């Protein structure tokens, strides 16, 4: 793993600072916001980073797919049998029980991943969780209530919706996760290896361009501690 | 009634909450569903109309006891639009006089 | 109506402006033949 450099960089033009000069704390607040953004952006790469291009195109890959290798890409490179790219005899994707029969609901798909892709001694780890975004989890609980259930089943469906577990594993809300994707791993199995001493933070008052700049080069690496317990599925064609 | 387009009203409330409401406020415990009294009546009506079994009847009574819709408390409000349904924490709504 | 908020605003009109960011800010650039082109994402939009 190469803890390679990420160039986070924010400039505040003098015009924006001046035109909003009435709000005394204006400047400070944007700093707070950008700090929050940066942290969020961090984890965003960790799941959308497909590669590290020498130049970042904010228009071609607004998901930051070319800034580093997120944990998901590490799976797609090292141990690509963990990455269930396609389902059983589907067409370049994983269909669900809507199209005939393949993994039925999402519960069976995560169950199969847990007992066929995660290593045996981790498949029964109590700490194993399932990272998912907003579309798949919400749309997984959706057919609990969209089926016109009876009152007992409606009480049960409300309870199941309360319990965020996918299949039998606790689920984790994660922004900017690649939709139609699912990760099964331990949160202790994921790590940021940043180079100590790689904080090239600097605050430049670039009058030559009339902007308050701020550079943070950060050497980081999205690394999975062990691939024994890091499985995933791609293209979960969740039919509706 | 026809096909499967948000099924019963609770499915619609769930989709509205988890696709339109901000993903981080989607689970604020005070997120209440504001809808007219008549709408709640018409959605809880099938629980007692379709001739369900007695144990399903006691379950239905339990649900009707819970004003909760979708999975969210429902606020019965007068003069609300027919065939409409708002969802928001009741501290979003301000009157600036 | 006991749950609605009542604020005594001393002006008919007015706005509240939300101070967001226009998305991702962190990227990477090889400075061998390039600059670390810094971009502003800070956006703000207001309700009236």
């Amino acid at each position: 793993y190469r803890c390679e450099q990420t160039n986070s960089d924010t400039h505040i033009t003098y015009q924006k600072l001046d035109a909003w000069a009435k709000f005394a704390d204006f400047q400070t607040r944007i700093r707070d916001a950008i700090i929050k953004r940066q942290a969020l952006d961090r984890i965003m790469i960790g799941f959308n980073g497909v590669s590290r291009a020498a130049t970042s195109d904010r228009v071609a890959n607004p998901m930051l797919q070319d800034v580093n290798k997120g944990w998901l890409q590490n799976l797609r490179e090292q141990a690509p049998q963990r990455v269930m790219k396609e389902g059983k005899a589907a067409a370049g994707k994983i269909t669900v029980g809507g199209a005939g029969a393949d993994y039925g609901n999402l519960d069976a798909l995560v169950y199969d991943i847990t007992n066929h892709l995660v290593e045996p001694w981790y498949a029964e780890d109590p700490d194993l969780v399932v990272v998912c975004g907003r579309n798949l989890l919400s749309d997984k609980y959706f057919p609990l209530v969209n089926r016109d259930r009876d009152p007992v089943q409606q009480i049960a469906a409300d309870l199941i919706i309360s319990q965020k577990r996918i299949g039998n594993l606790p689920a984790i809300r994660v922004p900017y996760f690649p939709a139609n994707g699912l990760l099964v791993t331990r949160l202790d199995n994921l790590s940021i290896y940043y180079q100590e001493g790689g904080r090239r933070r600097t605050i430049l008052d670039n009058a030559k361009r009339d902007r308050i700049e701020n550079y943070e080069s950060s050497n980081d690496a999205y690394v999975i501690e062990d691939l024994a317990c890091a499985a995933m599925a791609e293209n979960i064609a969740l039919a509706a | 009634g026809a096909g499967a387009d948000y099924g019963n009203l609770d499915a619609l409330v769930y989709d509205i909450t988890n696709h339109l409401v901000e993903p981080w406020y989607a689970e604020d415990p005070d997120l209440v569903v504001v809808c007219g009294r008549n709408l709640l009546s018409d959605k809880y009506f099938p629980l007692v109309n379709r001739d369900r079994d007695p144990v399903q009847q006691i379950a239905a009574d339990l649900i009707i006891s819970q004003k909760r819709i979708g999975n969210l408390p429902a606020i019965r409000v007068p003069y609300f639009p027919a065939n409409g349904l708002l969802v928001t924490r009741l501290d979003n709504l301000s009157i600036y006089y | 109506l006991k749950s609605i908020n009542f604020y005594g605003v001393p002006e008919q009109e007015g706005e509240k402006i939300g101070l967001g960011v226009s998305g991702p800010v962190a990227s990477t650039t090889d400075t061998t033949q390039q600059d670390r082109e810094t971009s502003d994402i800070s956006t703000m939009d207001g309700r009236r």
Binding site: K36, R37, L40 | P23 | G14, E15, I17, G18, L19, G46
Partner: peptide, 19 residues
């Protein structure tokens, strides 16, 4: 001409990142 539009400043809260 027309009254000044008084303005406050709300910080638009980002997605929570406790992950």
């Amino acid at each position: 001409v027309a009254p000044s539009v008084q303005q406050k400043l709300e910080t638009k809260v980002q997605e929570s990142s406790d992950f």
